Amino acid sequence: TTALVCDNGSGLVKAGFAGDDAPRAVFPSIVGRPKDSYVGDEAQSKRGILTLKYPIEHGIITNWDDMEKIWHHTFYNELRVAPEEHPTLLTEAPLNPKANREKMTQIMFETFNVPAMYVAIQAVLSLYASGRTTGIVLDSGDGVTHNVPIYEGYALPHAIMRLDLAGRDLTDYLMKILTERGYSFVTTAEREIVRDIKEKLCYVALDFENEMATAASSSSLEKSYELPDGQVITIGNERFRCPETLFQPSFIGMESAGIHETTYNSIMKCDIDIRKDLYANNVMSGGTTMYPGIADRMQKEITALAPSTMKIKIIAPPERKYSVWIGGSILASLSTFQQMWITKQEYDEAGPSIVHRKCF
Ligand SMILES: CO[C@H]1CC2=CC(=O)O[C@@H]([C@H](C)[C@@H](OC)C[C@H](OC)/C=C/[C@H](C)[C@@H](O)C[C@@H](OC)/C=C/[C@H](C)[C@@H]([C@@H](C)[C@@H](OC)[C@@H](C)CCC(=O)[C@H](C)[C@@H](C/C=C/N(C)C=O)OC)OC(=O)/C=C\C=C(/C)C1)[C@H]2O
Ligand SMILES: Nc1ncnc2c1ncn2[C@@H]1O[C@H](COP(=O)(O)OP(=O)(O)OP(=O)(O)O)[C@@H](O)[C@H]1O
Ligand SMILES: [Ca+2]
């Protein structure tokens, strides 16, 4: 019997079968109501005649009716499976409230009647996917960024840092700065286009000032992009100004430390004895870490903050868009994990609070 893995994200659901290389189903975490309801790709394409709901907000489920619709769509329409036949591994954000883990458990067992389930922390799975049980994860998605230090397989909750800046903020900022250049990116269709520009042409500069000076004095950094209707626009310093916001959040008026500083702060919250293990095992996870140049830049920035004798390694796997999912796939497949599933029987006897005893 094959386990399902469903990685529930603020922007995207990644779902598939444990053992697969990658999630079979990747679709927007959106529910539309005027059929009675629409989810994902279809909700997006039909958004004109629907009210859209975004039930996951900076990694936390906030609307359980809509989330039930997402999970229904995932099982029946995207994966074409009967939930009753499949143990299901779900993911959650670091520091997810206890009440949310219970609700997730109750819905899986009482609504979808799964035979077994488990809830795992997204950052922890990404670390596993990298081949490690010790390290510090920077997980940056569409809605939230976290730093999660993890030691011998378990997150250190008191050292976790949450930053409410992620990909959707970068897309919006790119819309703003392109509009400042003389283009017009304002509509919801235009947000989709700009997200595509972002994903194809943005990168992190090693030295922001130097890159701005190159863009000011030359066209060497410029790239062209054909809009749907064939109009060609040119992007120059916007390519690296957009992700620079990760390192300098005040560009969008956020009074927060950037991702190098949160990483450093998270390490410094940990026991001195393991700090060197964390510095040597910085793993990047999530779509918003996909920028070319980001690991080199992180290496530079962390080096400047850390002691001069410190060994620093930033690991940025090519598959890091899906490393949370991959981690869940390989966990659910593990022989030593089969005892860790919550069974339907255990739920039927103990109730939703079983999740606190068994998950983790
Ligand atoms: C087995 O298939 C792998 C991929 C792969 C595919 C392929 O086609 O080709 C094959 C290829 C031919 C290989 O064949 C086997 C050869 C390749 O040669 C270089 C080998 C690759 C390795 C897989 C390395 O990439 C990494 C490996 O190296 C030393 C690392 C292994 C570690 C030990 C594991 C663990 C991190 C991982 O085990 C599967 C996790 C899930 C362990 C989790 C635990 O032990 C936790 C602590 C406990 C308790 C739970 C705690 N929780 C939930 C806390 O929150 O779980 C029971 O980490 C892993 O296992 C990490 C990644 C595995 C992946 C992506 C799967 C191969 O490379
Ligand atoms: N190639 C890329 N370059 C830059 N950004 C990218 C790239 N690919 C995807 N992204 C961005 O990554 C985000 C989706 O990432 P991911 O699936 O990890 O987030 P999520 O799980 O939905 O959200 P969160 O983890 O914040 O809850 C989107 O903002 C998307 O535009
Ligand atoms: Ca995520």
UniProtKB/Swiss-Prot annotation:
Q: Which SMART domains match?
A: ACTIN
Would the keyword Hydrolase turn up in this protein's UniProt record? Answer: yes
GO terms assigned for molecular function: actin monomer binding; ATP binding; calcium ion binding; calcium-dependent protein binding; cytoskeletal motor activator activity; hydrolase activity; identical protein binding; magnesium ion binding
Q: Any idea of its EC number?
A: 3.6.4.-
Q: Where is the protein localized? A: Cytoplasm, Cytoskeleton
Record PTM: MICAL1 and MICAL2 produce the (R)-S-oxide form. The (R)-S-oxide form is reverted by MSRB1 and MSRB2, which promotes actin repolymerization. Can be mono-ADP-ribosylated on Arg-162 by SpvB of Salmonella spp. This modification blocks subsequent polymerization and leads to cell death.
Q: Name one GO biological process term.
A: mesenchyme migration
Keywords for this entry?
Acetylation, ADP-ribosylation, ATP-binding, Cytoplasm, Cytoskeleton, Hydrolase, Methylation, Muscle protein, Nucleotide-binding, Oxidation
Q: What is its main location?
A: cytoplasm
User: GO CC: one term?
Assistant: striated muscle thin filament
What positions are modified (ADP-ribosylarginine)? R162
Tele-methylhistidine found at: H58
Q: Which Pfam families match?
A: Actin
Which InterPro entries does the record cross-reference, listed alphabetically? Actin, Actin/actin-like_CS, Actin_CS, ATPase_NBD
Query: Where is region (Interaction with alpha-actinin) located?
Result: 95-108, 343-355
Enzyme class name? hydrolase
Which residue positions does N6-methyllysine occur at?
A: K69
Q: Does the keyword Cytoplasm apply?
A: yes
Where are the N6-malonyllysine modifications?
Answer: K46
Record's miscellaneous remark? In vertebrates 3 main groups of actin isoforms, alpha, beta and gamma have been identified. The alpha actins are found in muscle tissues and are a major constituent of the contractile apparatus. The beta and gamma actins coexist in most cell types as components of the cytoskeleton and as mediators of internal cell motility.
Assembly and partners are described as: Polymerization of globular actin (G-actin) leads to a structural filament (F-actin) in the form of a two-stranded helix. Each actin can bind to 4 others. Interacts with alpha-actinin. Identified in a complex composed of ACTA1, COBL, GSN and TMSB4X. Interacts with TTID. Interacts (via its C-terminus) with USP25.
Q: What does this protein do?
A: Actins are highly conserved proteins that are involved in various types of cell motility and are ubiquitously expressed in all eukaryotic cells.
* Protein family membership: Belongs to the actin family.
Q: What is this protein called?
A: Actin, alpha skeletal muscle
